[PDB]
């Protein structure tokens, strides 16, 4: 199995013991470390960030400490939007461009592959032409990746994919059966499935429905999401399910409506580190619990949930992880990737749990070490 792991290079500006940077990964937890992000300028790959060179260097250096791990770049995000991406894949000439900055790029700074994380081809503003693109582009990209191994007589880099956990997303997006001939693996984001926005509790990332939901709210889950990808083309071994190191937070209408389903108002409360409303880093969510909020196991979707007055989490555990990783073996998928280790307890003095308490949990479960 595999165990990929990202990385974000804003971690390093949170507070105190927030900040997070390459040198804090244990590197023996993952298989793959992904470098969330890189961006794009006049159709070419580029940082974002003032030291990503140097942050590089000391992310790649990780492999002399595991000889087995390997590293890839994301490019994109949530927060990268469209547009780029739209105007990249219009031409062969600008894919062109792209793919061979990518080259460069990723043999310059010690990179083995590059992830892919447009948020999404055909929404947020795409065409529906970008859903073909997208395949054009994966397609044409593993074929340059093929020629640069030949000429360059090094092994192939991988180019892998982030991609919807939403349905309509993913049937606005994506040429499953196609894209998954020439994606090394498919990272499956089962993750944001219930938040804010939808103006009542739910889980960030349940592993089955709740017992009531129908029609599309019943989409809202791992099982159905990872089954929709396998039964529409994508080969089981390539895919892999999204695990998330956080959770989403809500304001009750009433506190004493507290279950799944309670009515809520707003954006939901932020925490001290990652200053963001609507979630909390694991470590984050250490605090509130044992500041004594009430816990719940939310036994039909196996996920636990916490809530404190007016305050509801949506969150993931040890035994929640525990739950999932036995699922994702028992259902042949590839492995699992965690949105994002600078979530994690790193330092192991927020949660009483040790170090890395939620991969550590994967990497146990997945015989990764
Ligand atoms: C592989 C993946 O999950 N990609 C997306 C991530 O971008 C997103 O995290 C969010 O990334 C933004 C930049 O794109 C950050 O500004 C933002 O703080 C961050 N939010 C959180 C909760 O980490 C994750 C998680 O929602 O999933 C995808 O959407
Ligand atoms: C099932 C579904 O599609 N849920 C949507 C959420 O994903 C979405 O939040 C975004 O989810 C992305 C994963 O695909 C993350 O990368 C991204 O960070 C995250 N954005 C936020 C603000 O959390 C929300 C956005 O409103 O809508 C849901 O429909």
Same mark, same amino acid.
């Given at each position: 199995?595999?165990?990929?792991?990202?990385?974000?290079?804003?971690?390093?500006?949170?507070?105190?013991?927030?900040?997070?940077?390459?040198?804090?990964?244990?590197?023996?937890?993952?298989?793959?470390?992904?470098?969330?992000?890189?961006?794009?300028?006049?159709?070419?790959?580029?940082?974002?960030?003032?030291?990503?060179?140097?942050?590089?260097?000391?992310?790649?250096?990780?492999?002399?400490?595991?000889?087995?791990?390997?590293?890839?770049?994301?490019?994109?995000?949530?927060?990268?939007?469209?547009?780029?991406?739209?105007?990249?894949?219009?031409?062969?000439?600008?894919?062109?461009?792209?793919?061979?900055?990518?080259?460069?790029?990723?043999?310059?700074?010690?990179?083995?592959?590059?992830?892919?994380?447009?948020?999404?081809?055909?929404?947020?503003?795409?065409?529906?032409?970008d859903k073909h693109l997208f395949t054009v582009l994966v397609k044409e990209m593993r074929e340059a990746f093929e020629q640069e191994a030949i000429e360059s007589n090094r092994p192939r880099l991988m180019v892998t994919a982030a991609v919807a956990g939403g349905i309509?997303?993913?049937?606005?997006?994506?040429?499953?059966?196609?894209?998954?001939?020439?994606?090394?693996?498919?990272?499956?984001?089962?993750?944001?499935?219930?938040?804010?926005?939808?103006?009542?509790?739910?889980?960030?990332?349940?592993?089955?429905?709740?017992?009531?939901?129908?029609?599309?709210?019943?989409?809202?889950?791992?099982?159905?999401?990872?089954? %929709?990808?396998?039964?529409? !083309?994508?080969? $089981?071994?390539?895919? *892999?399910?999204? +695990?998330?190191?956080? &959770?989403? =937070?809500?304001?009750?209408?009433?506190?004493?409506?507290?279950?799944?389903?309670?009515?809520?108002?707003?954006?939901?409360?932020?925490?001290? %580190?990652?200053?963001?409303? !609507?979630?909390? $880093?694991?470590?984050? *969510?250490?605090? +509130?619990?044992?500041? &004594?909020? =009430?816990?719940?196991?939310?036994?039909?979707?196996?996920?636990?949930?916490?809530?404190?007055?007016?305050?509801?989490?949506?969150?993931?555990?040890?035994?929640?992880?525990?739950?999932?990783?036995?699922?994702?073996?028992?259902?042949? +998928?590839?492995?699992?990737?965690?949105?994002?280790?600078?979530?994690?307890?790193?330092?192991?003095?927020?949660?009483?749990?040790?170090?890395?308490?939620?991969?550590?949990?994967?990497?146990?479960?997945?015989?990764?070490?």
């Amino acid at each position: 199995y595999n165990l990929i792991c990202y990385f974000t290079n804003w971690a390093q500006y949170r507070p105190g013991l927030g900040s997070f940077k390459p040198d804090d990964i244990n590197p023996c937890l993952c298989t793959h470390l992904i470098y969330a992000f890189a961006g794009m300028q006049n159709n070419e790959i580029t940082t974002i960030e003032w030291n990503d060179v140097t942050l590089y260097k000391a992310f790649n250096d990780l492999k002399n400490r595991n000889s087995k791990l390997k590293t890839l770049l994301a490019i994109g995000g949530w927060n990268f939007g469209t547009a780029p991406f739209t105007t990249m894949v219009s031409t062969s000439q600008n894919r062109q461009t792209f793919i061979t900055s990518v080259i460069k790029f990723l043999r310059q700074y010690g990179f083995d592959g590059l992830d892919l994380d447009w948020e999404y081809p055909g929404s947020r503003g795409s065409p529906p032409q970008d859903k073909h693109l997208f395949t054009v582009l994966v397609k044409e990209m593993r074929e340059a990746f093929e020629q640069e191994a030949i000429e360059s007589n090094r092994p192939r880099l991988m180019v892998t994919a982030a991609v919807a956990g939403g349905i309509s997303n993913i049937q606005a997006g994506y040429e499953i059966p196609e894209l998954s001939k020439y994606l090394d693996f498919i990272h499956v984001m089962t993750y944001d499935l219930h938040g804010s926005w939808e103006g009542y509790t739910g889980e960030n990332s349940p592993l089955y429905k709740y017992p009531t939901e129908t029609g599309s709210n019943a989409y809202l889950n791992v099982d159905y999401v990872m089954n %929709y990808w396998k039964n529409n !083309g994508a080969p $089981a071994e390539k895919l *892999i399910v999204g +695990f998330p190191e956080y &959770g989403h =937070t809500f304001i009750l209408r009433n506190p004493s409506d507290n279950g799944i389903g309670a009515p809520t108002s707003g954006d939901g409360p932020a925490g001290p %580190y990652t200053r963001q409303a !609507g979630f909390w $880093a694991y470590y984050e *969510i250490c605090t +509130f619990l044992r500041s &004594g909020a =009430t816990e719940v196991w939310d036994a039909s979707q196996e996920v636990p949930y916490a809530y404190k007055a007016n305050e509801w989490l949506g969150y993931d555990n040890i035994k929640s992880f525990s739950v999932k990783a036995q699922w994702l073996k028992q259902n042949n +998928f590839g492995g699992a990737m965690i949105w994002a280790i600078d979530l994690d307890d790193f330092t192991g003095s927020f949660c009483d749990q040790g170090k890395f308490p939620l991969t550590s949990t994967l990497n146990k479960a997945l015989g990764i070490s």
